[PDB]
Write a protein that holds these residues in place. Structure first.
Motif, PDB file in Angstrom:
ATOM      1  N   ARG A 181       0.843  -1.185   0.000  1.00 26.69           N
ATOM      2  CA  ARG A 181       0.000   0.000   0.000  1.00 26.69           C
ATOM      3  C   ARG A 181       0.881   1.238   0.000  1.00 26.69           C
ATOM      4  O   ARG A 181       2.064   1.180   0.342  1.00 26.69           O
ATOM      5  CB  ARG A 181      -0.937   0.049   1.208  1.00 26.69           C
ATOM      6  CG  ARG A 181      -2.105  -0.911   1.173  1.00 26.69           C
ATOM      7  CD  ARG A 181      -3.036  -0.565   2.312  1.00 26.69           C
ATOM      8  NE  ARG A 181      -4.196  -1.439   2.429  1.00 26.69           N
ATOM      9  CZ  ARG A 181      -4.204  -2.597   3.075  1.00 26.69           C
ATOM     10  NH1 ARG A 181      -3.133  -3.043   3.709  1.00 26.69           N
ATOM     11  NH2 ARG A 181      -5.324  -3.313   3.106  1.00 26.69           N
ATOM     12  N   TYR A 188       1.425   5.418   1.084  1.00 19.96           N
ATOM     13  CA  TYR A 188       1.163   6.283   2.221  1.00 19.96           C
ATOM     14  C   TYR A 188       1.653   7.698   1.953  1.00 19.96           C
ATOM     15  O   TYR A 188       2.626   7.907   1.224  1.00 19.96           O
ATOM     16  CB  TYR A 188       1.854   5.766   3.486  1.00 19.96           C
ATOM     17  CG  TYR A 188       1.543   4.335   3.830  1.00 19.96           C
ATOM     18  CD1 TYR A 188       2.167   3.290   3.169  1.00 19.96           C
ATOM     19  CD2 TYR A 188       0.622   4.029   4.815  1.00 19.96           C
ATOM     20  CE1 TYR A 188       1.885   1.982   3.484  1.00 19.96           C
ATOM     21  CE2 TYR A 188       0.330   2.727   5.138  1.00 19.96           C
ATOM     22  CZ  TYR A 188       0.961   1.706   4.473  1.00 19.96           C
ATOM     23  OH  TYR A 188       0.657   0.408   4.807  1.00 19.96           O
ATOM     24  N   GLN A 245       4.075  -2.515   5.276  1.00 11.09           N
ATOM     25  CA  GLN A 245       3.622  -1.871   6.504  1.00 11.09           C
ATOM     26  C   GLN A 245       4.646  -1.973   7.629  1.00 11.09           C
ATOM     27  O   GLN A 245       4.656  -1.127   8.528  1.00 11.09           O
ATOM     28  CB  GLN A 245       2.282  -2.462   6.917  1.00 11.09           C
ATOM     29  CG  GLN A 245       2.350  -3.484   8.012  1.00 11.09           C
ATOM     30  CD  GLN A 245       1.083  -4.277   8.082  1.00 11.09           C
ATOM     31  OE1 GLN A 245       0.061  -3.865   7.538  1.00 11.09           O
ATOM     32  NE2 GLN A 245       1.129  -5.425   8.726  1.00 11.09           N
ATOM     33  N   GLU A 246       5.523  -2.980   7.585  1.00 12.35           N
ATOM     34  CA  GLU A 246       6.445  -3.229   8.692  1.00 12.35           C
ATOM     35  C   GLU A 246       7.442  -2.086   8.863  1.00 12.35           C
ATOM     36  O   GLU A 246       7.829  -1.753   9.990  1.00 12.35           O
ATOM     37  CB  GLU A 246       7.201  -4.544   8.490  1.00 12.35           C
ATOM     38  CG  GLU A 246       6.373  -5.831   8.366  1.00 12.35           C
ATOM     39  CD  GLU A 246       5.330  -5.798   7.270  1.00 12.35           C
ATOM     40  OE1 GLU A 246       4.216  -6.315   7.496  1.00 12.35           O
ATOM     41  OE2 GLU A 246       5.619  -5.234   6.194  1.00 12.35           O
ATOM     42  N   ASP A 289       6.242   1.548  10.870  1.00  6.19           N
ATOM     43  CA  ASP A 289       6.329   1.684  12.321  1.00  6.19           C
ATOM     44  C   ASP A 289       7.759   1.928  12.776  1.00  6.19           C
ATOM     45  O   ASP A 289       7.997   2.730  13.687  1.00  6.19           O
ATOM     46  CB  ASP A 289       5.733   0.463  13.006  1.00  6.19           C
ATOM     47  CG  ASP A 289       4.498  -0.036  12.304  1.00  6.19           C
ATOM     48  OD1 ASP A 289       4.605  -0.537  11.168  1.00  6.19           O
ATOM     49  OD2 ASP A 289       3.409   0.093  12.897  1.00  6.19           O
ATOM     50  N   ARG A 347      -3.033   6.683   4.765  1.00  6.39           N
ATOM     51  CA  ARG A 347      -3.150   5.627   3.774  1.00  6.39           C
ATOM     52  C   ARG A 347      -4.043   6.141   2.659  1.00  6.39           C
ATOM     53  O   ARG A 347      -5.116   6.688   2.926  1.00  6.39           O
ATOM     54  CB  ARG A 347      -3.732   4.354   4.387  1.00  6.39           C
ATOM     55  CG  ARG A 347      -3.790   3.172   3.445  1.00  6.39           C
ATOM     56  CD  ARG A 347      -4.598   2.065   4.072  1.00  6.39           C
ATOM     57  NE  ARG A 347      -3.818   1.190   4.937  1.00  6.39           N
ATOM     58  CZ  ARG A 347      -4.255   0.014   5.363  1.00  6.39           C
ATOM     59  NH1 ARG A 347      -5.466  -0.418   5.061  1.00  6.39           N
ATOM     60  NH2 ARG A 347      -3.454  -0.751   6.097  1.00  6.39           N
TER      61      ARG A 347
END
Lengths: 116, 87, 66, 51, 104
Positions: E2, E4, E68-69, E72, E91
């Motif tokens: 995805r 961002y 996504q990892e 963060d 997002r």
RNA sequence: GUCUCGUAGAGGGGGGUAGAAUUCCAGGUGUAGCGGUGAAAUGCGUAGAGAUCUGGAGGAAUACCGGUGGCGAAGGCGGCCCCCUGGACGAAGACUGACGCUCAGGUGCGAAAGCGUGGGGAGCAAACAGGAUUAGAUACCCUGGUAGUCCACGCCGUAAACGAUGUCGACUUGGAGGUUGUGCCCUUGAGGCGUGGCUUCCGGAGCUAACGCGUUAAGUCGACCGCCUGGGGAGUACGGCCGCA
RNA sequence: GGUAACCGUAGGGGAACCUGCGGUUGGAUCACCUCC
């Protein structure tokens, strides 16, 4: 002693004793009066006629600090409390800016319950 | 789940990989969701709202299996051993 | 009058300061939809975008800050 | 409101607070906001259709 | 996979080091096969209201596609630094590439 | 019923984060009252109050947008962002081939108030203390104020929990409006013609004791469930189950 | 553009009823010639 020229004033338009303060735009207070300082009491004190007297006490005590221009900050629900700023205007100080600073909340604390 | 993961199961359990209608692929897909989804509530115990969809899926799985039982026990049994279902 | 159906937006950017400042009132509030005549979906998008923009300091929360 | 205006003075230009503020605020906020029976308190707008 | 939008705030005292951090962060993103479609260095900006008794801040923006990892980890690397002031993550629906309407 | 592509949505848990607002603490200025009701008092008062400015600690809820709008099986859900997750709908086909409807027992979910163990505790506030007052008088009124209100982890399982209207299907003139999809005309731009969801209000046949409902029926029919049999005694007694109460 | 009488629940007390939390519209009293 000190010259302020373009000071700032603060009014508290409470349903009870109205607060009027003169401030020199740095937080230090020059003078102050209430509708209750003169010995007024009861409902004779909540009418808009009552708020004038404190305004003239403030004005006539602060002469030596030398206000020439002024700002005023108004917060409160009291009706017709701009009689105080009429009094400061009539006192000779050139009132140049006005803001309403009423402490509205973004629905925080819970307000007290009402009477019937 | 994801479209990539869904595509493999239909090709596996399906007749021709566009069939996607035979009860085998449906029950396989449902199992694929439940066994993965059981790890949701390992720590999201409080969620009472997706439990309704979960129980709907498990009910639908058991209900199509009870449909298979009345038509051919052979592929029913082969299917349940393939997926590891108890009953 | 409405700007969305004339200038063209399938999605509205929250960094577009023009159409944002155009719909905020004198004191930082949001205009109601009944005043302006915008469609409901676009009004909802404005309401979301401008509250992100307040977080992003592209707008102040209220005029009491000098 | 930041009031700054042309040189004429002492008009005080707050005659439009009626729509420049939701003037009922602090009349309804220093007391327990009831808010109940709200939609039928909006009901009266529909009653006026006539011809 | 995805995409961002990310925007953050930096202390103006650390102006010299804004683009060194930009390169470091995009290197960290790209090292795990990260990709970028848009990046803007909006530079110095006056704030709409004082935060941390400050009055100006440096703006940074980029649009990234990434797994996504890493997000963060990158956010924590924001939060642990001294010079960061504020951050934001978003997002998005599609990989937008056209430049940001601010610059006009 | 399944897959493909999309859309709207306060549908649910967890973690961050923001601004306004309220107390408390500290440091200046500064004068002596502040607070409250139809009037006063109680209470803080100059071992320096309020008012104002700055800094800090801490808790709760999200103004504005915001609507007979939206989501949800019901209860109910409203700052922003991220992670996880249920359902609904639309277009075009493709596939499975009666896999369906209802449901006694049963399981789960179920506002607020209430309990148990431990936290936290700004404001509000059952109980309690004080001041005052009328027309019985305690209560309505005003200062304070404990549980509670908040978070975990468990019980409780009742409401005018109501649309006072069980669920699922089929058939029968209309008009106006909201919200969300989507085809079409040579699109000569926000415009016209059509077609699907969910909703709001008038009204025809019909129904009704009437009020009224009226394609989201209380109209014409079919499948299954729950309930009723004059008012009080009474949703009380004695049993049984459940519950720490 | 303030018109409440009820609900579920917990502390109080008695011709009687009060409050704290949340919820609904079903939002008002009658039909008395001689003893009232």
């Amino acid at each position: 002693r000190k010259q302020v020229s373009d000071g700032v004033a603060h009014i508290h338009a409470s349903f009870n004793n109205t607060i009027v303060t003169i401030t020199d735009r740095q937080g230090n207070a020059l003078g102050w009066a209430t509708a209750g300082g003169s010995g007024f009491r009861g409902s004779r004190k909540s009418t808009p006629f009552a708020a004038q007297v404190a305004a003239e006490r403030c004005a006539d005590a602060v002469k030596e600090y030398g206000i020439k221009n002024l700002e005023v900050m108004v917060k409160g629900p009291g009706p017709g409390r701009e009689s105080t700023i009429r009094a400061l205007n009539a006192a000779g100080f050139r009132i140049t800016n006005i803001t309403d600073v009423t402490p509205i909340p973004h629905n925080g604390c819970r307000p007290p319950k009402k009477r019937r | 789940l994801s479209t990539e993961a869904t595509a493999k199961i239909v090709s596996e359990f399906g007749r021709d990989a566009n069939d996607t209608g035979s009860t085998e692929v449906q029950v396989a897909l449902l199992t694929a969701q439940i066994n993965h989804l059981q790890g949701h509530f390992a720590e999201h115990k409080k969620d009472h709202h997706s439990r309704r969809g979960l129980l709907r899926m498990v009910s639908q799985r058991r209900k199509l299996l009870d449909y298979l039982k009345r038509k051919d026990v052979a592929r029913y049994t082969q299917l349940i051993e393939r997926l590891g279902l108890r009953r | 009058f409405c700007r969305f159906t004339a200038e063209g937006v399938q999605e509205i950017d929250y960094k577009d300061i023009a159409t944002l400042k155009n719909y905020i009132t004198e004191s930082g509030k949001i205009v109601p939809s009944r005043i302006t005549g915008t469609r409901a979906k676009y009004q909802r998008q404005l309401a979301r975008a401008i509250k992100r923009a307040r977080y992003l300091s592209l707008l102040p929360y209220t005029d009491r800050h000098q | 409101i930041k009031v700054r205006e042309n040189e004429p003075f002492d008009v005080a230009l707050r005659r439009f607070k009626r729509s420049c503020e939701k003037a009922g605020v602090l009349a309804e906020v220093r007391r327990r906001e009831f808010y109940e029976k709200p939609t039928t308190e909006r009901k009266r707008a529909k009653a006026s259709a006539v011809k | 996979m995805r995409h961002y939008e990310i925007v953050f705030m930096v202390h103006p005292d650390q102006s010299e080091q804004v683009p060194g951090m930009i390169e470091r962060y995009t290197a960290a993103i790209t090292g795990a096969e990260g990709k970028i479609h848009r990046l803007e260095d909006w530079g110095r900006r006056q704030l709409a209201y004082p935060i941390n008794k400050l009055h100006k801040a440096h703006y940074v923006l980029m649009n990234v596609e990434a797994p996504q990892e890493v997000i963060d980890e990158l956010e924590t690397t924001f939060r642990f630094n001294d010079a960061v002031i504020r951050s934001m993550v978003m997002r998005t629906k599609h990989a937008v590439t056209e430049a940001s309407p601010m610059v006009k």
